[PDB]
Amino acid sequence: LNIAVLLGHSHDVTERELRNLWGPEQATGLPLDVNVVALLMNRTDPKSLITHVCDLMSGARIHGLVFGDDTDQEAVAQMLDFISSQTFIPILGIHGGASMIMADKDPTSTFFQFGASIQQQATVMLKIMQDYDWHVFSLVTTIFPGYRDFISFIKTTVDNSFVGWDMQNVITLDTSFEDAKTQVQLKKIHSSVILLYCSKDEAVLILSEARSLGLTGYDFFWIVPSLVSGNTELIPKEFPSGLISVSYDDWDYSLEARVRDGLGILTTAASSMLEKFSYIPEAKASCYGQPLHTLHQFMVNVTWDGKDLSFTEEGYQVHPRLVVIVLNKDREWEKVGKWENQTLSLRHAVWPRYKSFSDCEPDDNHLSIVTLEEAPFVIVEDIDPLTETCVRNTVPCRKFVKINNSTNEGMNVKKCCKGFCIDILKKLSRTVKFTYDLYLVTNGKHGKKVNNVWNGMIGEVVYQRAVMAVGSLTINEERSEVVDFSVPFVETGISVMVS
Amino acid sequence: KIVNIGAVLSTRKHEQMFREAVNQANKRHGSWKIQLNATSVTHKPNAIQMALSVCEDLISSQVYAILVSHPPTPNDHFTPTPVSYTAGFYRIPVLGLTTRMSIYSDKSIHLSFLRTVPPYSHQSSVWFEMMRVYNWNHIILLVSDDHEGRAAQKRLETLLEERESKAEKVLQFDPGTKNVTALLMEARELEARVIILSASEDDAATVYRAAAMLNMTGSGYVWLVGEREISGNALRYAPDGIIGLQLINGKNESAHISDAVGVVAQAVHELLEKENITDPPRGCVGNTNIWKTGPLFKRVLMSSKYADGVTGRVEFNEDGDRKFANYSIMNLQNRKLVQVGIYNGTHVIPNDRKIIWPGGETEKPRGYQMSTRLKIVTIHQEPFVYVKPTMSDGTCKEEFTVNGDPVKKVICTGPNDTSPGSPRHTVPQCCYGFCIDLLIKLARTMNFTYEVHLVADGKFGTQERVNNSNKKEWNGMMGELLSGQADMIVAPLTINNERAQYIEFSKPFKYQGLTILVKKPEERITGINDPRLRNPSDKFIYATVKQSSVDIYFRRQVELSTMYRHMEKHNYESAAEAIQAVRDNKLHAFIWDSAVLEFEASQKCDLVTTGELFFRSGFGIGMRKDSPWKQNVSLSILKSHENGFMEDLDKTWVRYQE
């Protein structure tokens, strides 16, 4: 039907590509009169919002409003939610402040957002923590609002997960910190992974206190949400290089594809509601002056061109597109990973160190360890599909399995390991109390020199791509020439098997 | 050198009082050159063009404080939201004065909203003061308004964090329906009588009529409501003797306006003493730049401490609420509002008037009556729970044993078969045996009736992912107990560390270990230390009951994952299925408790147990949390331990051989 798409942008996004968004789109047109009104607004005040709503609602009874924002104002989405409550018109928020996450909607309002809420983002972040076995962690909550729901969601998620999370007690705040009573709660922290829920101007002081108290070590982790991480240009120098963030800001999908998907959802809802009831277009005539069949609880079942764009009970997407980013050494928000329907994808399955967060951090405690698949020593099995977690005695590792012989591209499949040398390495980690980097070799067997070129674990250790070989390895003359073996611990010779 | 104050006020007398308070605000503040102007607007019956007129008039006026002071509005929406949102676009504090909705408490939504009235959830803290006075622990929550229901649950958990108790029943549903009396009867069957209600007038009158028709307003029924529930037809439908709350000067607008003028005036004179002064621009035309001292002026309003006013010590918390609020506690004595208490910010004092209750005496009714009919659920244990079909119609054939002991059966209710086998066939049959005689001994010791029914499946209950939202749930006897449908599990409960974290345990009545059922070259296995069972094959077929606690005990064992992967392909529904399968020589081993297989070896000589005795544990009675049915019942169990009644139960089934 009549749908108006108004866009408030600062970047030069023209209007004629929205005029071309009507022709080939909706080839199977079930409404007999589908019309679009493309408009561009330069100002971002709510007076213009009220003015354009009174213009377009009286403009031949437009039943669809689509808005995107370029600024950093979350109150514009609340104003559009109030407009959708008053005018009873389904309004969609696309980008920026029109897509910023709000807490609770109303049954009188039919406003919807194309975004990712903080609850699903916390689910994704705890999925990241489950996939890394980072079970000993903490939680610091400030006086930034929407925080008790976050604590309660963490409590219910820990109570409904197979991990059994070792969670340190919640460090709470009251005001801006005096560094007298909050100092005691920050000095209780001895765990690695630190979670935080605050604003950016609070996070500057939090990271300044954490650097002042030395909480930015190589062991210590920092995972922040998307609401504290604001503009991609405005990055202060107090951020640790390696800051984990999760935001749905995908640069691969532009605003035009998102509003095309929104128009597809609107036409899908209109065509599916027209098949049930006849008198579907019902709007308000004009603003000046003193509903039963609605699309508020109808388009939960929606799928546009195979894309799972279904809607939740709260009004958000069922399966959005989350993007896991970090902060590199070049002070840029580096795009790392994308998210699937329910499961999580990882382009960089190898977790990077970023061990030098600042300039003066002399740290050399990690150890690169590789082994080889042998049955009585390193039992290499799949991950448990019921838990998606290696059991207590098994440890995770990676294996670079190639797809074919046509390309050299492969995937680092993560698997579980147990056995003899796994127990030896775990007891070495108990005694020495170091940090290890366990993975598998994909070159082949133990070692063989082919024209001054070694292979396997010898090629990994001699060419210094690892540190030491904990797994099983025979000892002869040239291997003792190229590296330095330790003392022997097990008496393993050779034998001949007969009947 | 001017400060503008915007207001949405109707009556001309209160506009004159507001202008008089603005004029008197500059009296004691010296001859300083600051000026105060006030701009008040009326109200058009609509809400969009009202928001338009007010927002552009306050942009053209460049005000600092925005006030809405309209209680008696005919629209029940009570929404000053759009003007507050427009001021939050430039982070300008709007001081709401009338409504008490919890949607305004969210500062993430309402970025620049302040108020001098608390929400109703703080009244629950006053009701927690009732818990500080009347010493009542178990409550029954009923909230219809789901916009404030999550905040009420949050405040209730915050209050219960101190005592570390739990609410017995919580309810959230859609306002507008009428058939909520089923959950009212389910709350009536509970031990507590404390009724906490949080809804509008219509749902309050509906549940008053529902309690009046079903007579839930008799003796001991605790009723405790607020100001919204004692107005309109809910006041007409209210029973006599109900206890409610009253906001002192909650609707008295004239002193409230002067208090707001004093608060805003001292906030402005505090802000004038500091630097970085910014002004709101002409945001209607060509100005989207935000007012930079928004959170700065908010921080000025955070530490605002006052000492003037008829109400008293007005003070803001971290949520910007009202501290130290005088409340009144009213009683409805024969359709007349009678004051029975006063409340300062921390303490309740009843007045000289008496507290007349809807039940009996004027003292507090202890509405914690324990269940005299304990709902008993059990599983069909083969030597312990004998279930026999009825002879003609719901009867039990009173047969006699060989030792002159008449079998005292009971009419239990149980399903017929499994759910793919039997869709719906639940009949009353005759239950007797070991734990039935234990319950007879318990009913002989302590006078209490009971209700023996059966669990719907043949499983103990395991901790399994439900198929949505990644949530842990229980099932079986634990799933029927934690849902409130059961009261006491009388069954040989396998005591472990996981279930001890969730419920409380009693003393074990049975003490035994584990063993292997075989049929009679090494015909024996001698326990878990057989190396062929460490690395099994398709020959040695060994398994256990599906979803049993033995599987959980092996799941804790992190060195026997091979048996956990092997036995999952052959888990049966019941142990009698395993007995029938090894009777046909299809099984080879079965981990099970000791004395059950000893009794079955006494019944059938081909059934052979193993020699070792590992996991020497005890079986007791499945129980609830902290409850008065724990100590006396445990003393009765120990009284059964000390005498020869355990030997009598041995003479019934254990010592008796063939």
Swiss-Prot record, chain A:
Subunit relationships: Heterotetramer. Forms heterotetrameric channels composed of two GluN1/zeta subunits (GRIN1), and two identical GluN2/epsilon subunits (GRIN2A, GRIN2B, GRIN2C or GRIN2D) or GluN3 subunits (GRIN3A or GRIN3B) (in vitro). Can also form heterotetrameric channels that contain at least two GluN1 subunits and at least two different GluN2 subunits (or a combination of one GluN2 and one GluN3 subunits) (in vitro). In vivo, the subunit composition may depend on the expression levels of the different subunits. Found in a complex with GRIN1, GRIN3A and PPP2CB. Found in a complex with GRIN1 and GRIN3B.
Impact of altering residue 249 to A/H?
Answer: Nearly abolishes inhibition by Zn(2+)
Q: Where does L-glutamate bind?
A: 472, 474, 479
Q: What is the lineage of its organism?
A: Eukaryota, Metazoa, Chordata, Craniata, Vertebrata
Tissues showing expression: Detected in brain cortex, olfactory bulb, hippocampus including the dentate gyrus, striatum, thalamus, superior colliculus, inferior colliculus, midbrain and cerebellum (at protein level). Detected in brain cortex, hypothalamus and cerebellum.
Q: Which residues lie on this side of the membrane: Extracellular?
A: 1-499
Glycosylation, residue list? 42, 301, 404-405
Give each disulfide bond as a residue pair. Answer: 54-287, 390-416, 397-417
Name by which UniProt lists this protein: Glutamate receptor ionotropic, NMDA 2A
Task: Describe its function.
Answer: Component of N-methyl-D-aspartate (NMDA) receptors (NMDARs) that function as heterotetrameric, ligand-gated cation channels with high calcium permeability and voltage-dependent block by Mg(2+). NMDARs participate in synaptic plasticity for learning and memory formation by contributing to the slow phase of excitatory postsynaptic current, long-term synaptic potentiation, and learning.
Its UniProt domain note says: Contains an N-terminal domain, a ligand-binding domain and a transmembrane domain. Agonist binding to the extracellular ligand-binding domains triggers channel gating.
Q: Where in the cell is it found?
A: Cell projection, Dendritic spine; Cell membrane; Synapse; Postsynaptic cell membrane
Query: Which residues are recorded as binding Zn(2+)?
Result: 11, 95, 233, 249
Q: Which family does it belong to?
A: Belongs to the glutamate-gated ion channel (TC 1.A.10.1) family. NR2A/GRIN2A subfamily.
Curated annotation (Swiss-Prot), chain B:
Compartmental location: Cell membrane; Postsynaptic cell membrane; Synaptic cell membrane; Postsynaptic density membrane
Q: State a single Gene Ontology molecular function.
A: transmitter-gated monoatomic ion channel activity
Looking at the keywords, is Metal-binding present? yes
Output a single Gene Ontology CC term carried by this record.
Answer: terminal bouton
Protein modification: NMDA is probably regulated by C-terminal phosphorylation of an isoform of NR1 by PKC. Its phosphorylated state is influenced by the formation of the NMDAR-PPP2CB complex and the NMDAR channel activity.
Reaction catalysed by this chain?
Ca(2+)(in) = Ca(2+)(out); Na(+)(in) = Na(+)(out); K(+)(in) = K(+)(out)
Q: Which cysteine pairs are covalently linked by disulfides here?
A: 55-284, 396-430, 412-431
Question: What membrane topology term does the record carry?
Answer: Multi-pass membrane protein
Per the UniProt annotation, where are the glycans attached?
37, 179, 215, 252, 276, 326, 344, 416, 447, 467, 535, 632
Pull the Extracellular topological domain ranges from the record. Answer: 1-520, 521-658
What regulates the activity here? NMDA glutamate receptor activity is potentiated by Zn2(+) in a dose-dependent fashion. The potentiating effect of Zn2(+) is at submicromolar concentrations and its inhibitory action is at high micromolar to millimolar concentrations. Excitatory glycine receptors are inhibited by D-serine at 100uM.
Q: What is its main location?
A: membrane
Residues at which glycine binds = 492, 494, 499, 549, 593
Enumerate the UniProt keywords alphabetically: Calcium, Cell membrane, Disulfide bond, Glycoprotein, Ion channel, Ion transport, Ligand-gated ion channel, Magnesium, Membrane, Metal-binding, Phosphoprotein, Postsynaptic cell membrane, Receptor, Signal, Synapse, Transmembrane, Transmembrane helix, Transport, Zinc
The family annotation for this protein states: Belongs to the glutamate-gated ion channel (TC 1.A.10.1) family. NR1/GRIN1 subfamily.
User: Any idea what job this protein has?
Assistant: Component of N-methyl-D-aspartate (NMDA) receptors (NMDARs) that function as heterotetrameric, ligand-gated cation channels with high calcium permeability and voltage-dependent block by Mg(2+). NMDARs participate in synaptic plasticity for learning and memory formation by contributing to the long-term potentiation (LTP). Channel activation requires binding of the neurotransmitter L-glutamate to the GluN2 subunit, glycine or D-serine binding to the GluN1 subunit, plus membrane depolarization to eliminate channel inhibition by Mg(2+).
| Domain remarks in the Swiss-Prot or TrEMBL record | A hydrophobic region that gives rise to the prediction of a transmembrane span does not cross the membrane, but is part of a discontinuously helical region that dips into the membrane and is probably part of the pore and of the selectivity filter. The extracellular N-terminal domain (ATD) is a site of allosteric regulation to modulate overall receptor function.
Its recorded name reads Glutamate receptor ionotropic, NMDA 1
Which part of the full protein is shown?
Answer: 25 to 797 of 938
